[PDB]
Amino acid sequence: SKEEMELTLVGLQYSGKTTFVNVIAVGFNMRKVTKGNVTIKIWDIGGQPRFRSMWERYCRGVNAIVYMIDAADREKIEASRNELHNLLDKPQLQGIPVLVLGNKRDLPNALDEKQLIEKMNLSAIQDREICCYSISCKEKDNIDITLQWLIQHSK
Ligand SMILES: Nc1nc2c(ncn2[C@@H]2O[C@H](COP(=O)(O)OP(=O)(O)O)[C@@H](O)[C@H]2O)c(=O)[nH]1
Ligand SMILES: [Mg+2]
């Protein structure tokens, strides 16, 4: 039956947030995308240091948080891990499901799902449902399963 849901998309700069929205369809960009009888309102929020203080506010009240990672940029994983754990530590975000996406699977040296889970310390995240997929926006790889997970959280 016809529904609407809301997602906030975060993660470091260059991880592929805006690309992902483009494939599925600056400080902020809001877009609505319709899939599987569901209209998804997406907040694509900047990942540069100066925008990270606004992540919490944009995440409050959403159906799901999508956390984008450049899985091939291994140097940035530590920072990515830190920002994700710092975000999920904010009490007002208690219990919101999080989908962690290891983007750029098409590139040499891309971390797989196991490596992302371990290196991002996802297993430590206890208050909520958390999922992690390896994807390529460029080659449209594992985009379908990502959309299915999102739609399943339309509530
Ligand atoms: N090889 C590859 N490049 C990607 C992929 N997704 C995004 N990119 C590239 O990564 C760069 C940053 O993407 P963008 O969507 O601007 O990242 P944002 O800063 O998180 O919004 C751009 O050059 C994209 O073309 C992917 O799946 N594979
Ligand atoms: Mg962007």
UniProtKB/Swiss-Prot annotation:
<dbReference type="InterPro" id="IPR005225">
    <property type="entry name" value="Small_GTP-bd"/>
</dbReference>
<keyword id="KW-0458">Lysosome</keyword>
<dbReference type="GO" id="GO:0002505">
    <property type="term" value="P:antigen processing and presentation of polysaccharide antigen via MHC class II"/>
</dbReference>
<dbReference type="GO" id="GO:0015031">
    <property type="term" value="P:protein transport"/>
</dbReference>
<dbReference type="GO" id="GO:0090385">
    <property type="term" value="P:phagosome-lysosome fusion"/>
</dbReference>
<comment type="similarity">
    <text>Belongs to the small GTPase superfamily. Arf family.</text>
</comment>
<keyword id="KW-0342">GTP-binding</keyword>
<keyword id="KW-0131">Cell cycle</keyword>
<keyword id="KW-0472">Membrane</keyword>
<dbReference type="GO" id="GO:0090117">
    <property type="term" value="P:endosome to lysosome transport of low-density lipoprotein particle"/>
</dbReference>
<keyword id="KW-0813">Transport</keyword>
<comment type="function">
    <text>(Microbial infection) During Mycobacterium tuberculosis (Mtb) infection, is required for plasma membrane repair by controlling the exocytosis of lysosomes in macrophages. ARL8B secretion pathway is crucial to control the type of cell death of the M.tuberculosis-infected macrophages, distinguishing avirulent from virulent Mtb induced necrotic cell death.</text>
</comment>
<dbReference type="InterPro" id="IPR044154">
    <property type="entry name" value="Arl8a/8b"/>
</dbReference>
<dbReference type="Pfam" id="PF00025">
    <property type="entry name" value="Arf"/>
</dbReference>
<dbReference type="GO" id="GO:0005525">
    <property type="term" value="F:GTP binding"/>
</dbReference>
<dbReference type="GO" id="GO:0008089">
    <property type="term" value="P:anterograde axonal transport"/>
</dbReference>
<feature type="binding site">
    <location>
        <begin position="44"/>
        <end position="48"/>
    </location>
    <ligand>
        <name>GTP</name>
    </ligand>
</feature>
<dbReference type="GO" id="GO:0051233">
    <property type="term" value="C:spindle midzone"/>
</dbReference>
<dbReference type="GO" id="GO:0030496">
    <property type="term" value="C:midbody"/>
</dbReference>
<dbReference type="GO" id="GO:0048487">
    <property type="term" value="F:beta-tubulin binding"/>
</dbReference>
<keyword id="KW-0963">Cytoplasm</keyword>
<dbReference type="GO" id="GO:0101004">
    <property type="term" value="C:cytolytic granule membrane"/>
</dbReference>
<keyword id="KW-0132">Cell division</keyword>
<keyword id="KW-0206">Cytoskeleton</keyword>
<dbReference type="InterPro" id="IPR027417">
    <property type="entry name" value="P-loop_NTPase"/>
</dbReference>
<keyword id="KW-0967">Endosome</keyword>
<dbReference type="GO" id="GO:0005829">
    <property type="term" value="C:cytosol"/>
</dbReference>
<dbReference type="GO" id="GO:0031902">
    <property type="term" value="C:late endosome membrane"/>
</dbReference>
<dbReference type="GO" id="GO:0019003">
    <property type="term" value="F:GDP binding"/>
</dbReference>
<dbReference type="GO" id="GO:0001778">
    <property type="term" value="P:plasma membrane repair"/>
</dbReference>
<dbReference type="GO" id="GO:0061909">
    <property type="term" value="P:autophagosome-lysosome fusion"/>
</dbReference>
<dbReference type="GO" id="GO:1902774">
    <property type="term" value="P:late endosome to lysosome transport"/>
</dbReference>
<dbReference type="GO" id="GO:0005765">
    <property type="term" value="C:lysosomal membrane"/>
</dbReference>
<protein>
    <recommendedName>
        <fullName>ADP-ribosylation factor-like protein 8B</fullName>
        <ecNumber>3.6.5.2</ecNumber>
    </recommendedName>
</protein>
<dbReference type="GO" id="GO:0034498">
    <property type="term" value="P:early endosome to Golgi transport"/>
</dbReference>
<dbReference type="GO" id="GO:0070062">
    <property type="term" value="C:extracellular exosome"/>
</dbReference>
<dbReference type="GO" id="GO:0005764">
    <property type="term" value="C:lysosome"/>
</dbReference>
<dbReference type="GO" id="GO:0031901">
    <property type="term" value="C:early endosome membrane"/>
</dbReference>
<dbReference type="GO" id="GO:0042267">
    <property type="term" value="P:natural killer cell mediated cytotoxicity"/>
</dbReference>
<feature type="binding site">
    <location>
        <begin position="13"/>
        <end position="19"/>
    </location>
    <ligand>
        <name>GTP</name>
    </ligand>
</feature>
<dbReference type="GO" id="GO:0003925">
    <property type="term" value="F:G protein activity"/>
</dbReference>
<dbReference type="InterPro" id="IPR006689">
    <property type="entry name" value="Small_GTPase_ARF/SAR"/>
</dbReference>
